[PDB]
Design a protein around this ligand. Structure first.
Ligand SMILES: Nc1cc(-c2nn[nH]n2)c(S(N)(=O)=O)cc1S(N)(=O)=O
Ligand SMILES: [Zn+2]
Length: 229
C-alpha cells in the first residue's frame, strides 16, 4: 500500500488522491512524520502542504513527475509551521503558485518561514473568499477558527469523501492535542467541530501526524479540546 520514494512515503487514498509523508529526526525523540496531499484534477496536480524541508519537497515534485507526469498548478499550505511550510523555496524554484491564509503569510517571518506568494481570505463563517482561491478545482478551503494555531486552515476534496484537517485534527486514539505552543485552548473545541460541520459527508479524515482515520478523529479531538476550556 505504502510506496517508499527517497526519504518520503506515498499512499494512494483515492484514484486521484495521494498522501505524502516526510520525516524530521528529532534528537532523543525519534523521527516525526508529517502528512500532506497530492490531488490530480484532470491535466494538472494540486498539492496541500510542503514537506519539512526544501529537499524533501523537491522529492515530492520528483515523485509527481515520475508517477503522474502532470504539472503542479498550485499548492495550498495549512499554517506557518515547519511541517507545513518548510519547503516553500522548492515550490517557488519550480514555479508553482503558492497560497496560504493571509494570517499564515503575515506570521511566516516570525515563525522562520517564507510566505506563500498569494493570500487566501475568509468569510465570517470560515469559507474561503472564492476570488482569493482562483481555479482551485476540487480544493474547498475552510478556516475553522483558531485551534492548533490562530491561522490553521483545512481542505475538503470535492468529488471524494476525503477532508484534510492538517494539524488541527488528531486521530481517534490520540492521547493529547500535540504541540499547544501556538494554540488557542479556548476556541479549539469549537474549531474542531466547525471543521466536521463544514465537510459533514467526509468519511476519510486525513491529518498531519497520523494515518487517515474515520470521523471519530474529529469527535475525539473535540472531546480532548473540551478539557482545555
Ligand atoms: N512533534 C511536533 C508536533 C507538532 C504538532 N503539530 N500538531 N500538533 N503537534 C509540530 S507543529 N505543526 O510545529 O506544531 C512540530 C513538532 S516537531 N517539534 O517539529 O517535532
Ligand atoms: Zn503546527
Amino acid at each position: 500500500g505504502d510506496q517508499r520514494f527517497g526519504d518520503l512515503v506515498f499512499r494512494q487514498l483515492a484514484p486521484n488522491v495521494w498522501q505524502h509523508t516526510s520525516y524530521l529526526d528529532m534528537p532523543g525523540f525519534g523521527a516525526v512524520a508529517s502528512n500532506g496531499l497530492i490531488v490530480r484534477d484532470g491535466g494538472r496536480v494540486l498539492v496541500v502542504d510542503t514537506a519539512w524541508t526544501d529537499d524533501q519537497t523537491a522529492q515530492i515534485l520528483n515523485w509527481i513527475k515520475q508517477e503522474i507526469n502532470l504539472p503542479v498548478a498550485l499548492a495550498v499550505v495549512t499554517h506557518a509551521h515547519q511541517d507545513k511550510m518548510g519547503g516553500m523555496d522548492a515550490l517557488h524554484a519550480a514555479g508553482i503558485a503558492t497560497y496560504a491564509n493571509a494570517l499564515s503569510n503575515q506570521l511566516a517571518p516570525q515563525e522562520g518561514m517564507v510566505a506563500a506568494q498569494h493570500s487566501l481570505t475568509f468569510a465570517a463563517n470560515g469559507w474561503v473568499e472564492p476570488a482569493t482561491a482562483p481555479n482551485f478545482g476540487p480544493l474547498k478551503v475552510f478556516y475553522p477558527g483558531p485551534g492548533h494555531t490562530s491561522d490553521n486552515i483545512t481542505v475538503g476534496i470535492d468529488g471524494t469523501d476525503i477532508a484534510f484537517g492538517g494539524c488541527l485534527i488528531k486521530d481517534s486514539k490520540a492521547k493529547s492535542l500535540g504541540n499547544l505552543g501556538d494554540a488557542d485552548t479556548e476556541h479549539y473545541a469549537a474549531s474542531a467541530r466547525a471543521f466536521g460541520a463544514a465537510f459533514p459527508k467526509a468519511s476519510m479524515i486525513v491529518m498531519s501526524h497520523s494515518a487517515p482515520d474515520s470521523r471519530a478523529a474529529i469527535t475525539h479531538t473535540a472531546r480532548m479540546a473540551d478539557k482545555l476550556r
